Design an enzyme around this catalytic site. Sequence first.
Site, PDB file in Angstrom:
ATOM      1  N   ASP A  35      25.642  14.065  19.687  1.00  0.00           N
ATOM      2  CA  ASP A  35      24.954  12.927  20.297  1.00  0.00           C
ATOM      3  C   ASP A  35      24.916  13.031  21.822  1.00  0.00           C
ATOM      4  O   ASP A  35      25.937  12.882  22.491  1.00  0.00           O
ATOM      5  CB  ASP A  35      25.651  11.623  19.896  1.00  0.00           C
ATOM      6  CG  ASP A  35      24.901  10.399  20.369  1.00  0.00           C
ATOM      7  OD1 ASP A  35      23.674  10.348  20.165  1.00  0.00           O
ATOM      8  OD2 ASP A  35      25.532   9.491  20.949  1.00  0.00           O
ATOM      9  N   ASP A 218      18.025  11.852  23.676  1.00  0.00           N
ATOM     10  CA  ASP A 218      19.137  11.519  22.794  1.00  0.00           C
ATOM     11  C   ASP A 218      18.998  12.134  21.400  1.00  0.00           C
ATOM     12  O   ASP A 218      18.199  11.672  20.576  1.00  0.00           O
ATOM     13  CB  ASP A 218      19.266   9.997  22.671  1.00  0.00           C
ATOM     14  CG  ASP A 218      20.386   9.583  21.738  1.00  0.00           C
ATOM     15  OD1 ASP A 218      21.414  10.295  21.685  1.00  0.00           O
ATOM     16  OD2 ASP A 218      20.233   8.549  21.052  1.00  0.00           O
TER      17      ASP A 218
HETATM   18  C1  LIG Z   1      28.265   3.070  24.674  1.00  0.00           C
HETATM   19  C2  LIG Z   1      27.206   3.661  25.639  1.00  0.00           C
HETATM   20  C3  LIG Z   1      26.292   4.698  24.931  1.00  0.00           C
HETATM   21  C4  LIG Z   1      25.307   4.033  23.941  1.00  0.00           C
HETATM   22  N1  LIG Z   1      24.254   4.956  23.537  1.00  0.00           N
HETATM   23  C5  LIG Z   1      23.439   4.722  22.475  1.00  0.00           C
HETATM   24  O1  LIG Z   1      23.518   3.720  21.777  1.00  0.00           O
HETATM   25  C6  LIG Z   1      22.389   5.776  22.166  1.00  0.00           C
HETATM   26  C7  LIG Z   1      21.138   5.440  23.022  1.00  0.00           C
HETATM   27  C8  LIG Z   1      21.999   5.855  20.658  1.00  0.00           C
HETATM   28  C9  LIG Z   1      22.945   6.708  19.748  1.00  0.00           C
HETATM   29  O2  LIG Z   1      22.630   8.109  19.819  1.00  0.00           O
HETATM   30  C10 LIG Z   1      23.138   6.268  18.262  1.00  0.00           C
HETATM   31  C11 LIG Z   1      24.109   7.183  17.461  1.00  0.00           C
HETATM   32  C12 LIG Z   1      24.411   6.737  15.997  1.00  0.00           C
HETATM   33  C13 LIG Z   1      25.298   7.825  15.330  1.00  0.00           C
HETATM   34  C14 LIG Z   1      25.157   5.377  15.915  1.00  0.00           C
HETATM   35  N2  LIG Z   1      21.844   6.158  17.572  1.00  0.00           N
HETATM   36  C15 LIG Z   1      21.237   4.964  17.330  1.00  0.00           C
HETATM   37  O3  LIG Z   1      21.731   3.896  17.688  1.00  0.00           O
HETATM   38  C16 LIG Z   1      19.910   4.987  16.596  1.00  0.00           C
HETATM   39  C17 LIG Z   1      19.134   3.643  16.776  1.00  0.00           C
HETATM   40  C18 LIG Z   1      17.669   3.764  16.270  1.00  0.00           C
HETATM   41  S1  LIG Z   1      16.958   2.101  16.138  1.00  0.00           S
HETATM   42  C19 LIG Z   1      17.343   1.729  14.398  1.00  0.00           C
HETATM   43  N3  LIG Z   1      20.166   5.314  15.206  1.00  0.00           N
HETATM   44  C20 LIG Z   1      19.580   6.373  14.590  1.00  0.00           C
HETATM   45  O4  LIG Z   1      18.800   7.140  15.136  1.00  0.00           O
HETATM   46  C21 LIG Z   1      19.917   6.615  13.131  1.00  0.00           C
HETATM   47  C22 LIG Z   1      21.276   7.354  12.885  1.00  0.00           C
HETATM   48  C23 LIG Z   1      21.413   8.823  13.386  1.00  0.00           C
HETATM   49  C24 LIG Z   1      22.831   9.355  13.109  1.00  0.00           C
HETATM   50  C25 LIG Z   1      20.381   9.744  12.688  1.00  0.00           C
HETATM   51  N4  LIG Z   1      18.767   7.143  12.411  1.00  0.00           N
HETATM   52  C26 LIG Z   1      17.826   6.296  11.936  1.00  0.00           C
HETATM   53  C27 LIG Z   1      16.695   6.896  11.176  1.00  0.00           C
HETATM   54  O5  LIG Z   1      17.843   5.053  12.093  1.00  0.00           O
END
Ligand SMILES: CCCCNC(=O)[C@H](C)C[C@H](O)[C@H](CC(C)C)NC(=O)[C@H](CCSC)NC(=O)[C@H](CC(C)C)NC(C)=O
Length: 375
Positions: A35, A218
């Site tokens: 990530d 990302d």
């Molecule tokens: C605490 C400061 C840093 C915060 N950073 C973030 O939140 C970054 C921008 C996003 C992260 O990379 C985070 C990682 C997940 C494993 C929880 N991804 C997300 O939050 C996004 C949101 C899409 S809107 C429904 N989720 C996803 O992309 C997911 C899961 C992935 C493991 C494939 N996939 C799908 C199809 O929804």
Amino acid sequence: SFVEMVDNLRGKSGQGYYVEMTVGSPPQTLNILVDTGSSNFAVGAAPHPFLHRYYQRQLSSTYRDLRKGVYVPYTQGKWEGELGTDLVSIPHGPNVTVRANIAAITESDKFFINGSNWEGILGLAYAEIARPDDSLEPFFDSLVKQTHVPNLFSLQLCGAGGSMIIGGIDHSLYTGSLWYTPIRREWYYEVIIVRVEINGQDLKMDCKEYNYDKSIVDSGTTNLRLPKKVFEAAVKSIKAASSTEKFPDGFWLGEQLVCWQAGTTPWNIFPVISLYLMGEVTNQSFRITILPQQYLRPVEDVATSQDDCYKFAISQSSTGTVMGAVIMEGFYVVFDRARKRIGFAVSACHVHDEFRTAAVEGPFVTLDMEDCGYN
Ligand SMILES: CCCCNC(=O)[C@H](C)C[C@H](O)[C@H](CC(C)C)NC(=O)[C@H](CCSC)NC(=O)[C@H](CC(C)C)NC(C)=O
């Protein structure tokens, strides 16, 4: 030197790409998600319906408790845990071991995915966005301090896993030349989009709108996420282009999927999307072009038959532009932290039909690019 690292990622864009790692003494093997949009290294440290294995601090003679709790919210999903350090290694990565901070996840909500096969996350971004605060040195920073690995890594994600080259670039993983865009500020990997086109036609908006809040790269996000105003413009344009056919509005929301008879997908009726990124030199930019084969993500048939079904992988957001996996798949992406910049090149494992093709092209001129960043 990097051959041993080539092909070290598994998974898909729908559930993320992971690399194998070991923590503790004796070594415990875990699959960790890659990530670039966070900065916290965390692993499941307790049983959970969706976890196969997990980190057991009680079995590591090298575990050190930091006696501090920690919490991380993501756009979707979040977890609570307790900090601590331990020795970590990457089997199919550089042959070194480092002591790094590790959050032992004890509570979580909408974080782990049912049968995703990864049980941890590796934040490859900068300390500024680390939790609890920028004082918790992120994994890669540790790796660079404690070893001689160059401050640089690159990702090649492939669709229907990929490779993460730690410490360098592997020239066999991409064709053509690399084009670099400046990293605006070292917290997220923030870049500046200076122009957007759909089938060669400019979306004609204030380039500030493209970066409204921020634009980041990302690997942990699946979709290509765009700001409200931009998402509307894009979808209107993509609809018009593919008006020759019909889909439910739930489709343009990424909710319900669309199917076609095997091998009869009308790829041609869907437009290519070009993002122009700010360059290394004054008034110059390059563009990366993605095909519909990228922003239409393959999924299994609802009726489980012999059809080709897809989900629209472009959704809107309120936190700025996010260039997720669907955008990174076509390309080989270099995160040159040492020189505070990000490189793009056409990937070797590139999508393409017999007519169009994903590309990285430059140079282009763009007047007053620095007026695209939001403040
Ligand atoms: C605490 C400061 C840093 C915060 N950073 C973030 O939140 C970054 C921008 C996003 C992260 O990379 C985070 C990682 C997940 C494993 C929880 N991804 C997300 O939050 C996004 C949101 C899409 S809107 C429904 N989720 C996803 O992309 C997911 C899961 C992935 C493991 C494939 N996939 C799908 C199809 O929804």
